[PDB]
TrEMBL record, chain A:
Protein name: MCE-family protein MCE1c
Top-level taxonomic group: Bacteria
Gene name of the encoded protein: mce1C
Residue span relative to the full protein: 263 to 310 of 524
UniProtKB/TrEMBL annotation, chain C:
Lineage of source species: Bacteria, Bacillati, Actinomycetota, Actinomycetes, Mycobacteriales
UniProt protein name: Virulence factor Mce family protein
TrEMBL record, chain E:
Name of protein: Virulence factor mce family protein
Complete-protein stretch covered: 300 to 398 of 547
Highest taxon, organism lineage: Bacteria
From TrEMBL, chain F:
Domain of life: Bacteria
Protein name: Mce-family protein mce1f
Taxonomic source organism: Mycolicibacterium smegmatis (strain ATCC 700084 / mc(2)155)
Intrachain S-S bonds: C10-C37
Residues of the whole record sequence present: 312 to 363 of 518
Length: 48, 153, 97, 42, 54, 52
């Protein structure tokens, strides 16, 4: 229970970071995975 | 008696508010508990291999510190995904040799990773030989193309 | 519990697998990803890229092997390196049970 | 960072080739490199 | 919700990009675009002795 | 991958071309939401995209 206490402390200190992780990963995963959709590969744009 | 009054009232209110939640949560945890139990052997080795490959991918990222180091050799791509045959599936199950698990670590003695096919709606299993890409030519004005789209190229 | 010690290290890669979280800010400078291209036209690389699975697999791999190139620094010859699927002694898998 | 890296402009990723080299035979030939600018060690 | 809805597709596609014979991943470069397109051939990505079934 | 414009990438449902930024700026920007290819399931292009 004590080691769970310190783990839960360090996790409650970063609950907002976890919320931000989930918020961003839910708003870019669809756009990022869109690339590997036309075939057995991923598109790339080479501006050089 | 007075302490029992207080304790009973407090515990009763707690359980009234948080009993249905616990009951239905423990009801809905059965399928996921079975799921996690089935894929036990694919956990220790997976964590170990990701831990060991973390420095190897980190050195590739950080050997320069300003870009990524890659070898680019020209290769030919497979046939573009066709509309009805290649729709996504989330029915993937199992592991190598029919059961969940991990291979032995990929050294240089045994390089290639044995490809794994799963119920997905796409695969690159049959590409064991050189053939021309069936949609060899196409047009994006009237959408008239040569070749026949296939799942058996 | 068996894999607990390696968990914190694995978190560097187990979520974003192709990338490593440690070096995202410097490699990716915003919209565009900076990449260093080694367009390798080695004989073995072209042999693996094109002439794998045909009758001319060893036409140029062994040509370059007879030169000063050494097998240790060459990408492994897929016709002889025993992958775990068909390696001797049965399939090579590790099962935590 | 990675979310804005790929897939915002279109269906494609976004790759930038600051420095490119050619490997052939075992000599390696360089065409272009970028010493300073958007791609500097950091 | 979106993460659990759209990550396994990403996992499947990134597993499909990898070619065991050549190693690593494969990707091809890209009015919006040219009216005409071409695809000369499809090289051998795998071998009969490398395919394993889930 | 060899071959030129085999699947043509889609610009429907993504950021407009006039809204692109030059590669010089390493400045980060807030990533938008609801960005994916918006073709009516047609063509081989982006078959396994978000909409499917």
């Amino acid at each position: 229970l004590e080691q769970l206490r310190t783990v839960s402390d360090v996790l409650n200190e970063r609950k907002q970071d976890l919320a931000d992780i989930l918020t961003v990963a839910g708003k870019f995963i669809t756009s990022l995975a869109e690339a590997l959709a036309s075939g057995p590969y991923f598109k790339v744009m080479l501006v050089n | 008696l007075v302490a029992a009054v207080g304790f009973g009232n407090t515990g009763g209110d707690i359980f009234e508010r948080g009993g249905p939640y616990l009951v239905r949560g423990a009801q809905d945890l059965l399928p996921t508990s079975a799921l996690l139990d089935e894929y036990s052997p694919a956990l220790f080795c997976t964590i170990r291999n990701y831990h060991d490959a973390a420095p190897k991918l980190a050195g590739a990222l950080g050997g320069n510190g300003y870009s990524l180091l890659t070898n680019s050799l020209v290769v030919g791509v497979g046939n573009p995904y066709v509309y009805p045959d290649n729709l996504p599936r989330v029915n993937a199950k199992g592991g190598p040799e029919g059961r969940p698990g991990c291979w032995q670590p990929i050294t240089r003695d045994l390089w290639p990773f044995p490809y794994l096919v799963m119920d997905t709606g796409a695969s690159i299993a049959p590409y064991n030989h050189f053939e021309l890409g069936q949609p060899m030519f196409a047009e994006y004005v009237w959408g008239r193309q040569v070749g026949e789209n296939t799942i058996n190229p | 519990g068996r894999a607990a010690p390696y968990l914190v290290g694995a978190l560097k890669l187990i979520l974003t697998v192709p990338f490593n979280i440690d070096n995202i800010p410097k490699a990716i400078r915003g919209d565009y990803i900076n990449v260093s291209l080694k367009l390798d036209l080695t004989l073995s690389s072209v042999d693996n890229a094109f002439l794998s699975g045909t009758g001319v697999s060893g036409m140029l791999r062994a040509l370059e092997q007879a030169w000063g190139r050494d097998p240790a620094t060459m990408i492994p010859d897929v016709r002889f390196t025993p992958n775990p699927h068909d390696a001797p002694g049965g399939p090579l898998v590790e099962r935590g049970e | 960072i990675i979310g804005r890296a790929g897939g915002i402009y279109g269906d494609f990723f976004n790759f930038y080739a600051c420095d490119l080299t050619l490997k052939l035979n075992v000599r390696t030939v360089r065409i272009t490199t970028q010493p300073s600018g958007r791609c500097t060690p950091k | 919700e979106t993460g659990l809805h759209a990550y396994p597709n990403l996992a499947a596609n990134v597993l499909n990009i990898n070619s065991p014979n050549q190693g690593g991943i494969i990707g091809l470069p890209v009015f919006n675009y040219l009216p005409f397109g071409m695809n000369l051939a499809s090289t051998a990505m795998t071998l009969p002795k490398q395919i394993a079934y889930s | 991958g060899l071959g030129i414009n085999a699947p043509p990438p889609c610009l429907t449902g993504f950021l407009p071309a006039s809204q692109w930024r030059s590669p010089a700026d390493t400045r980060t920007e807030p990533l938008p939401s609801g960005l994916y290819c918006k073709i009516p399931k047609d063509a081989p292009n982006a078959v396994r995209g978000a909409r499917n």
